[PDB]
Design a protein around this nucleic acid. Structure first.
Lengths: 204, 478, 293, 204, 204, 184, 193
RNA sequence: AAUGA
RNA sequence: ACGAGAACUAGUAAUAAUUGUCAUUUGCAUA
């Protein structure tokens, strides 16, 4: 029984709006800074990697997916329980970035003003959207459980596919209108518990 | 026809000419109520008992004053019991129906008296008992008639058991002061503990039913053992039974014997979680009547001796036999948690399995029959079993317990905060009699058993709403 | 004749028949059990305290106030809702000097904690294997206010009570209830001698009030119940380590008087054997601790 | 499943005034330079390609429009499920322009003074408008989702129609007086996720 | 739906003072050469072609104009939405003019000294003003949208009249004293988007 | 709104020196040949016409003139708008003069050499139909006064008197009859 | 015969959700309304982890006592409570004790979304805890403490409560003290991290 | 800069 | 030798899909 740890940095490319309040952005209430919830990341990876493999109409109805997808994220509802293997924790604002922003006096949040033009009348109506600044960083951690020895290489291949797909997609809302693009950098793999070596493993 | 039956029959219906006079039927509404009733009943062939006619014709003063009857004839004892108890077209429709029922349905032979009792109850439970301008009549005609019967039978037990034959001279105030009859009380403990010994929410009505049925069975048995009827039972329910008997040596000995048998059987069936206590205090004709506010005193004394009997409910032999070793290690009842009784395969003992089965049957079937062998245990090696309607009439053709169904004529059947002030005081002055507690108990029982079901027929927030509604209704009650 | 004060800080589970039940106090038999188990655990001698120690029931206390069980000596509606009477008024209670309004105020002031049904689950079932239903169960707990707790009375010579001091010092780290190994029922204690407790314990009268649960020996029962007012309560339960199957081992039923009993004629008690088809005896405590008023 | 990448440069012909903060312009605040938001590009292309096809008054009432328009830009509002198939990203002030402008000492912003003449009164009112400078450049990236293997050619034809129409129109604000005219240069098509061909595809 | 292009050259004969930087002349910051803002042309043409038709004093107070002017230019101010149908861009030095002034060693600006002689005192006050060298050529473009297949002919007749009135006037400032006289040349029509027939249209 | 036009030529007899340089003469740097600022003619006709009619000292302090000058010439600085109705454009040479001078090989600067011709083109807007006659007779008077006065700087020693010739009064925009007018 | 006490604090790294009442309602006291961690939670999670690692060890330390052999529990785990330092600091900085998180769910084939709420104990809080060990066999204390150390390690790299696959529950252990509280056995050398 | 949705 | 003792309120799901800070406005009037 072994547990493998993955840590790294999320970098914001264009403005990001997780916006879980409802238009505010989600904040920790001990520090008053933005955070990236982990259920967002898990849900987006579920959707993307599921659509990669065959997604059927009958498989559309029941929220069941391919066997591989269920194996990596868990089903545990179908009368055939499936325990998950990949635990996704939240990510928080980094100390390097808060130092930099306080030094150069850069506010942490933008308020973009937007407009809509309706048809037949051309009377516009405006609105306000808050969004994280670009150049921000967050620190992310993943844990993966070795419930079986012979599936590790395949599972990490699939996680690499999910990373690629997410890095060519968006997190949060307003993704088609511009918001929410990310990259991952400075990763690291380590066997934090157990006796399973993880030197040949990599997530780009 | 035993003379006891003659008195009892002339006793229940001794006050029916009052209805035939209120009905306005010109045929029999011209004279005094006694002769109106006699003229009415002088039709039907079954009711042609001569001494019953004599009993019903003269239940007042002048009637006996001018009738020069014999020395042994129940009109005098009728007079005495009546006195001690005393302390518009719908009526015409009712007397049409009465004529039809009397000429068609009922039987007059021995053992038909309970059927006659249910008939009178089902018909008369709302007739105004009297319209006296100087009195507040919070009683129905049923209560006057029934308590007159109970008093009559008790007075007769007393007078006859002491070998007096000159009833007229003895009973025609001086007798009213003698310690003539008794008040008797049964209280069963442990109801709250036994009712909450279930492991879900609607299942705690079956064992409520079991407790209620046992109380009614034991009280009906007691009345049978003493050659009276269910007339002499004032109140039942909760865990209580308030009853009235006579003050003689023979009944005292029989009460003691019955007490010993009940104590033995309750200990046998259940170790100590359910008991039964019986206490009796003597009363005169004056005590139940309102003379010097002594009725409160009587009630308090009965409660006092009841508390004392509760304090010392066992003896040394019993407590040593209780602490005698017995086999264990076998499983206990999955719902009742008691390891002194052989258990079946399903995991429930005899009584708890019987209760669950009888509740399953009660949800569909609705007649209970008291037999020698059957399903659920009762006192004196008797059992209760479940049967349906037509089955009930076929069994009657060859005792039955129901649920708030006033079916009449089918053999013998028995249809099943500030409380202390109401039960002990009632009306302190000018109305402090046994009849008033009788009617108060009847009205409270109608509210508790029948009106509550009607209220709940349409039924956290609900609990609060029901509490507020109950408080408001009780405020309106008094 | 010292008294022991105990404060808990965590909820406790005492219970009557099931785990759903929550109870405020325990009985002298439960504490005799605790002390006996702890002595056998510490490796000392049970001989000294088998037949020299007299214990009483547990009783509640509040900020600077003490309560005692209702003795079985006009309104007859308010007293019946009362379980404990304060010490200052105890004598006044037995002389009929307590009024209805005072009793009602007492009922008002007597809140010393609250109740809670904690719901839990069990997944040790075939949930480990595959699809299998979970099993929600319920435990009942009682919780104290910051300044309420329990007190006990113990008497005898100085040596026996020094032994008792040592036993309580060791015991204060185990528990006194049900789900002890789940995180319930620990305490800290102090040894007290109050003046008025000693005054009540040293009265002189003709009757006697029982502060424990006890049973008369055979040869005296016939003379014990000459004029008495008591309550019989069946006491049953399961054992801790008699034989192989726990289920096959369950104590034989026992009946004993309650803690408000009044007896005109005193009896000594006994420690009763309630074992059968076991390897070693299982004792129930039954020895009375009187107060004579 | 496949995602295809479009990329290129926007060339500013006359002054551009998005004014997303409004008379200032919309700026980043990690670098304090102008940007072109993706929202405006998406909206303007959609309005052109909808007007070019049919526009009915009842269809004008509620933003109900042609089928291809909703297939390529997304509605999923009327109980019909349609998420957008084209992902449009923001435009960031390019590096080559930064180098050239720095080493010739040319600012990134013109300040134009404007005048209004009243009717029958002949009084002038002055105004100031802050326009992005001419000759600038920006960089844009689009992502195309392939949800159906037999519509790629048609959707790309519609896209090149929208691009051509916009090369003959204005992006920004106040374009009927000489603002916002743009051009597109150096367009490259790549398939980022999948095994799909993009050698015959083109956008002018 | 289609879009026609109108292109040509504006030739200045006398002084041209526009002064949009204001006394210098408005100038591009990337080439350092003058321009004519499109705002100036649109405003001047609107005022001329609007004064010709009915110009009521009550309309002047409420700034209401004639229907032809609003359909050709758009106001959308009185609650009635009218989007502009004619788009006017700026002007810039043509390549031939640049080559000519470079070969002939002739500058792009004249400094005129003007003297004010005041009543009753006779004190000469001098001033310096910058003007654009006469004989230079600017390149202009208009874009015309078709929203109704019919009214194109009437619209082009009106734009002809507007060009005529402008050619008999001055552009910019300092007109009633000798500056601003220009004319149009080399006008061309070429349909650039759509499928419309506009080869018989004629802008002189 | 009709645009009527006036055009004509001006003949030079006394060697002219305007003083547009503020000793040279103002030149358009496209041809390096003399010009005439339109402010020159505008202001000089303005001053002569103002002098002819009554000129008040208080109005001299405040740069206020007669209503005729405020209409024809127009100032629009007193809080009452008066947009000018007579656009004067800058005057250039005539190609006739250039050809004659090139044939005879004569320079232009000595001062403005004698014998020149100048093409002046005025645009008159008809903002009101009625006042057309009054405005044009006033313009005729102003032209006569200019013909009998001097234009230029420092001309009080013999320079700056010139003649008017060869007019043409053509309507270029509108549908108004302009045949009965005259400006000699 | 000796009893040993292991005391310390546990810090909440990401939001915690035990939620016995639900699932938003987090377990509290019904009077002081302060969140707590029940000891059954810790006992069960540690049992599951240590069993997955591997038996007689789990049976001697947590106790089975019905499998045909009877083993008595050797480790007692108590409830945990909010600490005074954290209450003071939060009261000064004006922070609530509990957060509310809003979430959403998406239908496949229908793309319609519907909401949820999850109540969750705040980041940075602290709890105080004590464990008791009863030394019934002298030659086994080192083995039992090796096993308890492994369990705390595993729980540190795992989650407590519900919804931990989506980002809740992570905890740390600080400030350990190991004192022998009854008897005369030498426990000044033990370590638990 | 002026008034709006 | 205490109505005892073994017992994770767990498990699957996120912040969504659509939307142009746009429409009208001559750095202009006098020696």
């Amino acid at each position: 029984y072994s547990k493998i740890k993955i840590s790294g940095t999320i970098e914001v490319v264009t403005g990001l709006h997780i916006g879980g309040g409802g238009s505010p952005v989600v904040r920790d209430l001990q520090t008053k800074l933005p955070i990236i919830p982990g259920s967002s990341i898990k849900g987006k990876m579920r959707n993307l990697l599921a659509k990669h493999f065959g997604l059927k109409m009958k498989q559309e109805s029941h929220n069941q997916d391919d066997e591989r997808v269920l194996r990596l994220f868990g089903s545990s509802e179908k009368g055939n329980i499936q325990r998950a293997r990949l635990q996704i924790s939240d990510a928080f604002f980094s100390e390097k970035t808060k130092e930099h922003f306080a030094q150069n006096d850069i506010a942490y949040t933008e308020t973009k003003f937007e407009n809509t033009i309706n048809r037949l009348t051309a009377v516009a109506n405006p609105r306000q959207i808050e969004r994280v600044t670009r150049g921000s960083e967050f620190d992310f951690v993943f844990i993966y459980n070795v419930d079986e020895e012979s599936q590790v290489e395949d599972d990490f291949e699939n996680i690499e596919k999910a990373i690629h797909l997410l890095e060519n997609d968006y997190l949060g809302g307003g993704g088609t209108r511009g918001n929410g693009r990310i990259q991952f950098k400075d990763t690291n793999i380590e066997t934090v518990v157990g006796e399973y070596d993880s030197t040949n493993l990599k997530i780009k | 026809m035993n003379k006891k039956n003659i008195l009892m029959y002339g006793s229940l219906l001794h006050d029916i000419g009052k209805i035939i006079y209120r009905s306005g039927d010109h045929t029999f509404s011209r004279g005094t109520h006694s002769k109106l009733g006699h003229q009415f009943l002088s039709q039907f062939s079954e009711f042609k008992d001569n001494e019953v006619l004599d009993n019903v014709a003269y239940h007042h003063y002048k009637e006996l004053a001018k009738a020069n009857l014999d020395n042994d004839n129940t009109a005098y004892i009728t007079y005495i019991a009546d006195n001690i108890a005393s302390g518009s077209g719908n009526y015409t429709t009712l007397m049409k129906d009465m004529s039809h029922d009397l000429e068609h349905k009922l039987s007059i032979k021995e053992g038909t008296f309970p059927s006659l009792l249910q008939w009178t109850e089902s018909l008369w439970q709302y007739v105004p008992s009297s319209t006296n301008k100087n009195q507040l009549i919070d009683i129905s005609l049923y209560d006057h008639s029934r308590i007159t019967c109970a008093i009559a039978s008790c007075i007769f037990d007393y007078l006859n058991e002491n070998n007096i034959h000159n009833y007229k001279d003895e009973l025609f105030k001086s007798f009213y002061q003698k310690e003539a009859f008794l008040l008797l009380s049964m209280d069963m403990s442990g109801i709250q503990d036994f009712i909450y010994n279930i492991s879900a929410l609607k299942s705690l009505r079956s064992r409520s039913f079991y407790l209620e049925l046992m109380l009614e069975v034991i009280v009906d048995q007691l009345l049978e053992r003493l050659e009276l009827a269910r007339a002499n039972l004032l109140y039942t329910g909760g865990g209580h039974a308030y009853l009235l008997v006579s003050n003689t040596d023979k009944v005292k000995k029989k009460i003691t014997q019955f007490n010993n048998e009940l104590k033995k059987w309750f200990m046998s069936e259940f170790t100590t979680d359910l008991s039964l206590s019986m206490a009796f205090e003597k009363c005169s004709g004056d005590d139940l009547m309102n003379t010097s506010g002594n009725y409160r005193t009587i009630w308090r004394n009965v409660s006092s001796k009841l508390s004392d009997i509760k304090a010392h409910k066992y003896s040394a032999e019993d407590i040593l036999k209780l602490n005698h070793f017995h086999s264990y290690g076998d499983r206990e009842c999955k719902e009742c948690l008691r390891s002194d009784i052989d258990i079946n395969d399903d995991g429930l003992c005899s009584i708890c399995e019987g209760i669950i089965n009888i509740s399953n049957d009660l949800r569909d079937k609705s007649f209970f029959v008291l037999s020698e062998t059957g399903k659920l245990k009762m006192p004196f090696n008797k059992f209760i079993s479940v049967i349906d309607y037509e089955e009930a009439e076929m069994l009657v053709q060859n005792r039955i317990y129901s649920k708030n169904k006033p079916y009449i004529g089918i053999g013998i059947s028995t249809n099943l905060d500030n409380l202390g002030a109401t039960f002990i005081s009632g009306i302190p002055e000018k109305y402090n009699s046994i009849s008033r507690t009788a009617t108060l108990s009847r009205q409270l029982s109608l509210f508790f058993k029948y009106e509550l079901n009607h209220l709940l027929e349409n039924y956290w927030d609900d609990i609060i709403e029901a509490s507020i509604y109950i408080n408001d209704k009780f405020k309106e009650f008094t | 004749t010292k008294v022991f004060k105990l404060s808990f800080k965590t909820p406790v589970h005492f219970g009557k028949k099931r785990l759903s039940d929550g109870e405020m106090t325990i009985t002298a038999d439960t504490l005799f059990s605790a002390l006996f188990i702890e002595t056998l655990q510490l490796g000392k001698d049970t001989d000294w305290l088998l037949n020299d120690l007299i214990i009483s029931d547990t009783f509640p206390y509040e900020n600077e106030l003490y309560y005692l069980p209702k003795p079985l000596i006009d309104n007859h509606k308010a007293f019946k809702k009362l379980k404990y009477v304060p010490v200052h008024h105890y004598n006044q209670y037995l002389n009929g000097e307590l009024s209805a309004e005072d009793a009602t105020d007492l009922n008002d002031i007597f809140n010393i904690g609250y109740f809670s049904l904690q719901t839990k689950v069990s997944l040790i079932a075939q949930e480990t294997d595959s699809s299998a239903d979970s099993e929600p169960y319920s435990v009942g707990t009682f919780t104290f206010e910051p300044e309420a707790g329990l007190y006990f009375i113990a008497k005898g010579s100085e040596e026996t009570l020094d032994h008792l001091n040592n036993i309580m010092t060791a015991l204060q780290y185990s528990g006194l209830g049900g789900k002890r190994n789940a995180g319930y029922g620990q305490f800290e204690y102090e040894i007290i001698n109050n003046q008025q407790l000693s005054k009540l314990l040293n009265q002189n009268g003709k009757h006697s009030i029982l502060l424990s649960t006890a049973m008369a020996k055979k040869e005296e029962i016939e003379s014990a119940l000459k004029e008495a007012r008591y309550i019989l309560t069946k006491r049953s339960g399961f054992v801790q380590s008699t034989n192989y199957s726990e289920m096959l081992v369950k104590k034989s039923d026992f009946y004993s008087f309650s803690s408000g009993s009044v007896f005109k004629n005193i009896f000594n008690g006994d420690i009763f054997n309630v074992g059968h088809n076991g390897k070693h005896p299982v004792y129930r405590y039954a020895k009375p601790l009187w107060l004579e008023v």
